[PDB]
């Protein structure tokens, strides 16, 4: 359909010296989308020094002409916000709806926060004595790289590259295999806005080899990653043995929901529905294990049934259209092989379980929306993060109980609980283990709120401040005014 | 001394292993102790110990952390001597130096942090009149360090006093080269009120007790201090066992760059301390000096004139400034790099042997050595010796100097010695390193943060910053409007 997509180096499309091409194709029809080039590892070498000679240039401008460069680029892709949106859609498989309204405008409300925010990046002073002083330098890594997942692509990699630009660095980004397209769309605005050649390359690839040359890479300063905890296991542990790269890692989870007693079971329904069934439950925060008390089991069960009703599958580029396809046909194969296994265990299956077959259905990997019940901690469903719209109910008697078993897992990545009570409100997420936590809502991931996973879910943090500050290095310089005494 | 047990929970235990090893007093060849290593089980043990512990701990308030830190303080205090001749026996180090440095700036850290303990804190970000956020600086939990020989207890206190202070339990392994400081800490800890298994300290083998700690399912953060090579393999098995969370201070081949204008006493001065202290096993030191062709040849004549100040002899004697290297094995690998140096065509300008005699022959001596007509690919000037080796290099005009000092892939330390107000900053803010010295060179204050670019570690120690990243941020929601789902 679209011409063969060149890698993206220094302010401009470049073919791959790889000789190696891979093929995007739509998840809702099939379709072959593009043939995309694969970066080898001499093409990642001139990214690499493409990115160095830029990033000096980008890093010698002062604070505000930085911002300005950013602001230029958040306000090109709020203009092209529903054209990459369609892309979007196009490449993932996500229901218009969600792309045009959350993708593009969230990725650039990043965006548009760390522009803001580079020239509030500070330094510290130390006075030690009268004849000496500390100061610190917050200095960029240098160059840097971005690994980005399938489910949100371009918001991935805004996420990635805004404070890593606003701190002064370059960003090499490798997006998904899967989802090549918006990035390099994300390099043309980045180029158009007065972003230095080289300061955003987007180098498309599969994992196993383009991935792997930039974790390998002896000059990139740090690797930011996106995907699942396995995956992210091994991008850490390469990315530590090449050359000791500083590291941030968002992986997936298996977050609780949590619905107190005395909780309006409408809005507890309607959290959970949102906290599983959006982008057709490709979403790392997705609160799967919900947590009902076993009194307002059977009303909820029901609740959900009443909600399950209004997902609309369909076109996705027609406006009531609310649930799509999965990303890929192996996706939807792993995801039936998990409700397969809560069938088999003995999860009780209240609606969906299968594939979704028929007209406007036969040609793209769609999946039921599908809820369990009578769920326990051992089940496989319950245990490990499936990536599709499969929502576990778990019964539960008391509140030590339902805190403990929310913990009692190797993720920490969200959490939630539904209460109009202000002590169990705060006195109960304050228990959970996890780095995002959600009050009576689902979901939400202001530009201005930290966000990333306790234990398995993650190292490090992206959004809010700390991430301007976490794209810099501490530099510590002591000015010593007396006369330095040697003992020898 | 009698066979050392592990510290676990607030007292002493025997090991599971049914291993044991010795640690030597570096000046004599003698057994000072033989320790037991901790196996697999025994890491358990502790985790499990360490996991009740911090509930107690951080479920006190901020000042009561702080009071029972500071009692610790004054108990380091009144016990820096005793504890300084633990630790030269321990190391070879001088006392001149244990006394004077090592206790006495591993608890001013912890004092440093036993006062901010009350100040830790998150944010509050207002989304609209109807939605809030909160953040929440919570603690890891259980966490490691893994510490080095060159500076045991020093080590020791720098992880343990941010690691506490933010809440955490803290287990500890301290080298098998010098294990026995920690545990001397471990009970100064409960002395001072710390719950049973907030501090435990298992003395082991790397290979062994070091990999189970970093293997750990429960253990949410490991901060190393060691090598450059070792430094690599514990991060990476730290990521690949559970995900946890690192800091890595590793070593270094920090630049010492002389300007032209520098009076050549003070360069010569600050060259000697970046090179000999703690006789060269540093990993700050200023290894790599830089001094200007024109003024190079008076250079290496003050250098000659202060090495012959240089006091070998008696670690107890108030005149000593200057030990044998802490292990005989250690010594072998600093005298192959002094080969490399003599093979590679460096001019011999002092030292480059072991030395002998009377007093010297039981010990692993190396003498003070300087290396000089040095070049950039030589392997005495690419590689870390972690011994007292110094190389002088010539250099022509300031960008040069500036790109040798970069072109390497470590990054700890560096210095500039110029009275010049331009030359000072505006050479060491182009210098690829994380700790950077004008006009002086090793003062590491509580408050400064430290640690290394690029091959030379992973995050920082000491100041306010690794008080926070001893903590987790939980970022929190509260949303008081009517939640929409479009289900």
């Known amino acids: 359909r679209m011409a063969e997509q060149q890698l993206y180096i ?107 925010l580079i020239p509030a990046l500070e330094g510290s002073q130390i006075p030690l004595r009268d004849s000496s002083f500390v100061y610190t330098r917050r200095e960029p890594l240098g160059v840097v790289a971005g690994i980005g997942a399938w489910n949100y692509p371009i918001q991935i990699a805004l996420w990635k590259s805004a404070p890593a630009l606003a701190a002064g660095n370059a960003m090499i980004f490798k997006p998904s295999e899967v989802t090549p397209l918006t990035a390099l769309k994300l ?18 690839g599969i994992g196993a080899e383009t991935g792997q040359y930039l974790t390998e890479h002896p000059d990139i300063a740090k690797i930011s990653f996106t995907g699942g905890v396995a995956s992210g296991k091994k991008v850490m542990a390469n990315s530590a043995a090449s050359s000791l790269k500083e590291v941030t890692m968002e992986l997936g989870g298996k977050s609780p929901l949590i619905i107190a007693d005395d909780a309006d079971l409408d809005l507890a329904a309607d959290i959970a529905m949102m906290a599983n069934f959006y982008s057709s439950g490709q979403v790392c925060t ?18 959900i049934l009443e909600r399950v009703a209004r997902i609309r599958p369909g076109d996705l580029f027609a406006d009531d259209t609310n649930f ?19 069938k088999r265990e003995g999860a009780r299956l209240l609606c969906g379980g299968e594939a979704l077959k028929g007209d406007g259905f036969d040609n793209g990997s769609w999946v039921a929306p599908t809820v369990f019940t009578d769920c326990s901690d051992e089940m496989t469903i319950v245990r490990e993060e499936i ?56 979901g939400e991931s202001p530009a201005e709120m930290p966000v990333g996973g306790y234990k398995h879910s993650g190292i490090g943090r992206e959004n809010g401040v700390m991430t301007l500050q976490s794209y810099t290095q501490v530099k510590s310089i002591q000015v010593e005014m007396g006369k330095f005494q040697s003992i020898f």
């Open 10 to 116: 220094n302010g401009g499309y470049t073919s791959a010296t790889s000789g190696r091409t891979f093929e995007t194709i739509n998840p809702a029809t099939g379709e072959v989308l593009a043939t995309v080039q694969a970066a080898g590892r001499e093409d990642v070498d001139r990214a690499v020094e493409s990115a160095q000679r830029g990033q000096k240039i980008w890093a010698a401008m002062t604070a505000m002409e930085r911002s300005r460069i950013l602001r230029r680029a958040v306000d090109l892709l709020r203009q092209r916000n529903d054209e990459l949106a369609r892309l979007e859609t196009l490449d993932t498989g996500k229901p218009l709806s969600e792309t045009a309204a959350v993708d593009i405008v969230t990725g650039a409300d990043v965006l548009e926060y760390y522009a803001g």
């Open 187 to 204: 390099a043309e605005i980045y180029s158009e806005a007065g972003l230095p050649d080289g300061v955003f390359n987007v180098l498309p």
């Open 286 to 303: 997705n609160g799967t294990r919900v947590f009902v008390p076993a009194k307002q089991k059977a009303e909820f069960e029901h609740k």
């Open 324 to 342: 799509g396809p999965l990303v890929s046909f192996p996706h939807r194969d792993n995801v039936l092989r998990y409700i397969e296994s809560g």
């Open 387 to 442: 990536f599709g719209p499969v929502m576990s109910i778990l019964s539960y008697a008391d509140e030590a109980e339902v805190i403990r078993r929310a913990n009692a897992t190797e993720y920490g990545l969200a959490a939630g609980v539904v209460t109009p009570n202000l002590n169990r409100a705060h006195r109960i997420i304050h228990q959970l283990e996890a780095g995002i936590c959600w009050i009576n809502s689902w």
